[PDB]
């Protein structure tokens, strides 16, 4: 939901 | 090294305006989303503003103290995110930081503006070299759960962020193997298997809730 992007 | 280096604060009077800026190297900037995050003696850290991406239409959340009178924005070809900062109070002072990445891995230096719902943490705690150590993070509105995405940042003199864990319990890259996250009893929780001299500092949780996040109040820790 929030910036999951590694 | 990533570099978030912001400039703009200064010496300010109520009712003004000012505007901070934030540039980024070292990362894919335009992947990522920003985040205005600042500090006051007043309990700071707080969560002001959040930038998503192009594919996103750049959309934007505000805490609710600063809602109608700032304005986040980004500027993906000059690596740079921006706070413009209208009708100035009293209680806007402290130094801002732009923060981003997994979900707060990267900190700015800060930038100091002077102007002239509950997550709990432990106050202090006490250790020496090769003990470990769990500082944890509990919400008033019950049990912590990964939809929470505990971070854990580190705050070291004077001012200097780095983020340690994200989405409860990944490493940032380049974090020492000694940290780690949990959740444990209904809490976020950060434990330092081994503590060093070094990681005496100032610890914070942050928690998201739908649409924001929530900082604690931190946890000085002290290593004899």
Same mark, same amino acid.
Do not use: A, D, I, Q
């Given at each position: 939901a929030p910036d999951t992007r590694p | 090294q990533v570099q978030l280096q912001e400039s703009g604060g200064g010496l300010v009077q109520p009712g003004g305006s000012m505007k901070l800026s934030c540039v980024a190297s =070292? @990362? %894919? @900037?335009?992947?990522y989303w920003m985040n205005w995050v600042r500090q006051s003696?007043?309990? =700071?850290?707080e969560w002001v503003a959040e930038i998503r991406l192009k594919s996103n239409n750049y959309a934007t959340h505000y805490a609710e103290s600063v809602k109608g009178r700032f304005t986040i924005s980004r500027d993906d070809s000059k690596s740079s995110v921006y706070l413009q900062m209208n009708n100035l109070r009293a209680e806007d002072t402290g130094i801002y930081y732009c923060t981003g990445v997994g979900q707060f891995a990267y900190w700015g230096q800060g930038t100091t503006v002077t102007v002239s719902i509950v997550v709990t943490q432990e106050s202090a705690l006490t250790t020496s070299p090769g003990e470990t150590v769990t500082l944890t993070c509990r919400s008033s509105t019950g049990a912590v759960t990964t939809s929470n995405y505990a971070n854990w940042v580190q705050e070291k003199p004077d001012h200097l962020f780095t983020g340690l864990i =994200? =989405? %409860?319990n990944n490493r940032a890259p380049g974090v020492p193997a000694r940290f780690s996250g949990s959740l444990i009893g209904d809490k976020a929780a950060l434990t330092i298997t081994g503590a060093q001299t070094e990681d005496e500092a100032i610890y914070f949780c942050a928690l998201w809730y739908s649409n924001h996040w929530v900082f604690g109040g931190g946890t000085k820790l002290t290593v004899l």
């Open positions: - | =070292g @990362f %894919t @900037f335009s992947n003696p007043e309990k =700071g850290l =994200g =989405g %409860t």
